[PDB]
Amino acid sequence: LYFQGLEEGFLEDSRASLALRNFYMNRDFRKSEEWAQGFLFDYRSGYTEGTLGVGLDLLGKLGVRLDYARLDATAKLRLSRSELKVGGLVPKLPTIQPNYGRLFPQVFQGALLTSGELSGLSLNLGRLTEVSSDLALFNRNRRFAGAAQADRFDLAGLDYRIAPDWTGSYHYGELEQVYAQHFLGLKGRIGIAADSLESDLRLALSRDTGGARGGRIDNRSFSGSLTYRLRNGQAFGLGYQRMSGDHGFPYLEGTDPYLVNFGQYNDFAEAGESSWQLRYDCDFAPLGVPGLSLMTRYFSGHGAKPKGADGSREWERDSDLRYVLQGGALKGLGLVWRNATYRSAFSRDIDENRLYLTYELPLF
């Protein structure tokens, strides 16, 4: 956390890995398909010597259908308990979260400063200018006037350790001339007593800003969860979510929305929409079968006020099965199967399968 810069570490502490990813996706409307192999070279330098240390990250991506090629560089500066990254960025913030269900998450260009000079307090500040063309408001079901674009997305935030099991966060995000969103969140855990109860509460307020290319937007979002997690590998979760104001929940193209009732397909984020989620996870590891996990969840939404369409109710069931080989030559191989059923009164019904074969190979 504190950066000493006592040794010349750029080359010496360098590490890298190659990720191999085979992804298949199947989609039935009311039909399409996608199959692809990805290669991902992920390099992370150490830091040059001195109180201000300099570093370099590199992301090399190759994608082939059934030819996509990209190289993203990131300069990193390190001083005291603060870090500045400039170049390719994969932010993980309440206002901007990667899309993970693909071959590769989007890379954003800009600068991001994080700082933990104060104990228990993290601060961040950032500005993004590009996505792997401009940053754009993700329309989806015509929730807004159009998919407005901008040159700049600003961000600032604070995450505070209130107590060892409690954290509160505030984050601000603004796609310039389109919308600004305020986020406030609280996460907590209590013991009961070999097991635990976790809570995750999220309020967000979004309004159009400046030229309002989106255009007029008013969204007040609540999204929260309660998870009962047992020591034997099981978890039971309850999620609840509500959209208030004249619009649905805005977020950028290329990102997943930071909402708890977000499934494999739907985000239950139409204007006016309330939704409930039940979720069950099971790890078969402390039961006998390590590497094998399973998840299922069901979401139900009502009170949606979709634009230009009639109907207000919708639901989704996702099931997820995963296995990772535990030994032999392929001791890293991961199989993931994500299946979904989505039914809506106001948008197109879908059935979908996603399949992932993953392997991670450390180079140095």
Report the CATH number that the domain containing residue 201 is assigned in CATH.
2.40.160.10
Domain assignment present for residue 326? The answer is: yes
CA 136/CA 227 separation, integer angstroms: 33
Q: What gap in Å lies between CA 109 and CA 6, rounded to an integer? A: 30
**In 10 A of CB 123, how many CB atoms?**
16
Which secondary-structure segment (H or E) carries 6? none
**Residue 260 domain-assigned?**
yes
Does a structural domain hold residue 8?
no
Measured between alpha carbons, how far is 98 from 92 in angstroms, rounded to an integer? 6
Q: Is residue 7 part of a domain?
A: no
Question: Domain total for the chain?
Answer: 1
Measured CA angle at 292 (ends 198, 315), to 5 deg:
60
**Nearest to residue 63, comparing CAs of 21, 25, 95?**
21
Which run of H or E residues covers position 289? none
Residue 3 lies in a domain: no
315 neighbors 300 (Cβ within 8 angstroms): yes
* Contact assessment for residue 299 and residue 315, using Cβ atoms and an 8 Å cutoff: yes
Which range of residues forms the domain containing residue 191? 13-364
Give the Cα separation of 279 and 276 in Å (integer). 10
Per DSSP, the residues of 133-199 read --EEB--STT-SSS--EES-EEEEEEEEEEETTEEEEEEEEEETTTEEEEEEEEEEEEE-SSSEEEE
With vertex at residue 31, the alpha carbon angle to CA 27 and CA 32, rounded to the nearest 5 degrees, is: 65
User: Are 103 and 80 a contacting pair, CB within 8 Å?
Assistant: no
Measured CA to CA, the distance from residue 310 to residue 346 in angstroms comes to 6
Q: Would you say how long the chain is, in residues?
A: 364
| Residue 5 falls inside a structural domain | no
Report the sign of the C-alpha dihedral through residues 258, 260, 266, 267, in that order.
Answer: negative
Residue 45 has φ and ψ, to the nearest 5°, of -75, 165
- Could you say which DSSP state residue 96 is in? B
Cα–Cα distances in angstroms (integers) from residue 61 to residues 13, 250, 332, in the given order: 22, 29, 20
Residue 4: inside a domain = no
Look at residue 1 and tell me if it is in a domain.
no
